[PDB]
Amino acid sequence: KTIIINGVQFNTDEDTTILKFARDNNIDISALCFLNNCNNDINKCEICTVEVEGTGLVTACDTLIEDGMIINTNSDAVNEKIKSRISQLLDIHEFKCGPCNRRENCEFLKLVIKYKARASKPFLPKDKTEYVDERSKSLTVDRTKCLLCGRCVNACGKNTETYAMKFLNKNGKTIIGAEDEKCFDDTNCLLCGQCIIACPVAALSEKSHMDRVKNALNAPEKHVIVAMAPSVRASIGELFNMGFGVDVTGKIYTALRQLGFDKIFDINFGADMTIMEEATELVQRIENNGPFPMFTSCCPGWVRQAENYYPELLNNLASAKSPQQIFGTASKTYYPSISGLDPKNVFTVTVMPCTSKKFEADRPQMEKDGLRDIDAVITTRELAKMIKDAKIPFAKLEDSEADPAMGEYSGAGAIFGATGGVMEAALRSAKDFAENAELEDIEYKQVRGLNGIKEAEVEINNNKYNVAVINGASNLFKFMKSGMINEKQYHFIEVMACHGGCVNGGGQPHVNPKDLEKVDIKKVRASVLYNQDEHLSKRKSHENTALVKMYQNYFGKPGEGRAHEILHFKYKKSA
Ligand code: 402
Ligand code: SF4
Ligand code: SF4
Ligand code: SF4
Ligand code: SF4
Ligand code: FES
Ligand SMILES: [Mg+2]
Ligand SMILES: [Mg+2]
């Protein structure tokens, strides 16, 4: 093929789109609705308009290059077409970037500025209440920002295959929303927030818990614990311009203290707890020769998927609470016993890469004696906003350490946030537990990485066992519907609803789709976690000294009695 673009001749054998070819050759073509290798098939945004001599104006994102094509990306006709589309989008867009939560990284604003577009009539609703949906415990919608680009719909389809995000005909107008325009929580939605990650503007957001947190912090009698997820320390730096793949663990501990939190712990402590309980259960099942398979239960997106699509597997889930809720449980029981705090005055806050965690924390039965395991959950993005509002110079902060009692963690706990992390961590303990040994080879590289479905054969006490790692909600559907689960007897299966694991969670920093072209965000965020594991002295959950003391002095033997009654949670199907 010979192609001419803006007077420049190219010779190529490639079969690809105008958009992809131009960008591979440093030619600028704007786009909006094209993402995840899909555009909006009905009602295309046409921001990728280019001119093909002989043909006219075409959409570059879904038009293949052809031999003999003469292309102009920046002619008068092209720019006025694009400007006109943006102008029309402004006509249905509350253009008020001041108090907008996407002010600093909005795709639409950048386009508006680039083409100097203006609305034919500014959209200024007086009563936004009919445009906003805040019913969900996890997600919120503000349709005064929505461009109807379909990016959330395609991402839901591609990441989960549930199609819980749909186009709807509402009062004769097109919107996006859940089936029947119900609250997402009341549908098959996983509350995973991949739709939010896909959104170019502030139409989709997390359900805020920031007011819960600020109120607890300012409440005189409240003692506010905070603990961040594995993934946060590998990610939040992005939002302070520190680059990608930067370990900012110590800076976070420092920032949290400056925010006024009363105790700094870590969810990775909770991860080690979950392994204590879950590895014990795995060994138990092995000894009882069943039931198999056991599934992880730490991902609330997967739990909702099981509840909504495979309720028969609910009994197969590990009874151990997630690191979040198991941590919380201990924060209202164990922690008062070593601090003298009144349990009622403890207010437990987590920082998560996840929107689904908010729903998990607000489950009615996730409490004991009237005390919630977890009182608030803020996303990585929310914590970043609190830090900036407080004018804390994050990139300049000196490192501090966590408070040790529920703050220490092993390398096993640290890798939880990557797909295959829970699996690897769990095997390191299950092998030691079952063989009554302290084995030296602890790295299970076979369950790592971005393959959608991963399997391995493991030898535990000189018997062979089959494990699988399901990487993404759509891959759980594939695993089940394809019958792959029946090709052999699986004994232990990890499921994460977000591809890449929690490092790619719905509460994570948005990433410029151009930076995404340059950076493997799932691998670079994960690399921070495996790096920590590499350099930690303790690399098994049961070698966590603060945790061992907690079990020795308070809970007793894991997976049994006191531990079972308090630290476990079983999901049940309808009769
Ligand atoms: N609870 C919990 Fe987890 C832990 O530890 C997080 O905090 Fe995850 C992360 N990062 C999230 O969100 S949940 C799914 N299991 C893997 S990691
Ligand atoms: S979504 Fe973007 S363009 Fe719209 S008000 Fe917010 S920052 Fe401005
Ligand atoms: S939260 Fe997840 S399952 Fe629900 S609509 Fe968004 S992408 Fe789909
Ligand atoms: S919510 Fe966001 S991603 Fe979905 S159609 Fe509206 S602007 Fe596009
Ligand atoms: S994979 Fe992690 S971030 Fe994604 S829904 Fe599950 S727990 Fe949340
Ligand atoms: S980016 Fe090509 S039609 Fe939207
Ligand atoms: Mg298409
Ligand atoms: Mg206070």
mmCIF file of C-alpha atoms and ligand atoms in Angstrom, residues 93-98 100-104 106-109 112 144-145 200-203, ligand 2:
data_model
loop_
_atom_site.group_PDB
_atom_site.id
_atom_site.type_symbol
_atom_site.label_atom_id
_atom_site.label_comp_id
_atom_site.label_asym_id
_atom_site.label_seq_id
_atom_site.Cartn_x
_atom_site.Cartn_y
_atom_site.Cartn_z
ATOM 1 C CA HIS A 93 -22.961 19.835 28.674
ATOM 2 C CA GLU A 94 -22.799 21.772 31.930
ATOM 3 C CA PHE A 95 -19.511 23.485 31.135
ATOM 4 C CA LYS A 96 -18.442 24.547 34.640
ATOM 5 C CA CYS A 97 -14.986 23.137 35.253
ATOM 6 C CA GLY A 98 -14.277 25.066 38.451
ATOM 7 C CA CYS A 100 -15.736 19.667 38.617
ATOM 8 C CA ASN A 101 -13.900 16.575 39.871
ATOM 9 C CA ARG A 102 -12.340 15.926 36.421
ATOM 10 C CA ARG A 103 -11.079 19.523 36.112
ATOM 11 C CA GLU A 104 -7.419 18.488 36.081
ATOM 12 C CA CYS A 106 -10.727 15.897 31.469
ATOM 13 C CA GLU A 107 -10.611 14.672 27.850
ATOM 14 C CA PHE A 108 -13.535 16.848 26.742
ATOM 15 C CA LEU A 109 -12.085 20.103 28.134
ATOM 16 C CA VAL A 112 -12.846 22.165 23.686
ATOM 17 C CA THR A 144 -25.199 16.917 32.736
ATOM 18 C CA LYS A 145 -21.641 15.852 31.819
ATOM 19 C CA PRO A 200 -13.702 10.753 29.531
ATOM 20 C CA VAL A 201 -15.600 13.273 31.711
ATOM 21 C CA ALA A 202 -17.219 13.587 35.138
ATOM 22 C CA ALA A 203 -20.496 11.888 34.200
HETATM 23 S S1 SF4 B 2 -16.567 17.146 32.608
HETATM 24 FE FE1 SF4 B 2 -14.692 18.199 31.838
HETATM 25 S S2 SF4 B 2 -15.456 19.835 30.444
HETATM 26 FE FE2 SF4 B 2 -17.239 19.136 31.678
HETATM 27 S S3 SF4 B 2 -17.283 20.614 33.466
HETATM 28 FE FE3 SF4 B 2 -16.059 18.789 34.148
HETATM 29 S S4 SF4 B 2 -13.910 19.343 33.670
HETATM 30 FE FE4 SF4 B 2 -15.235 20.809 32.518
#
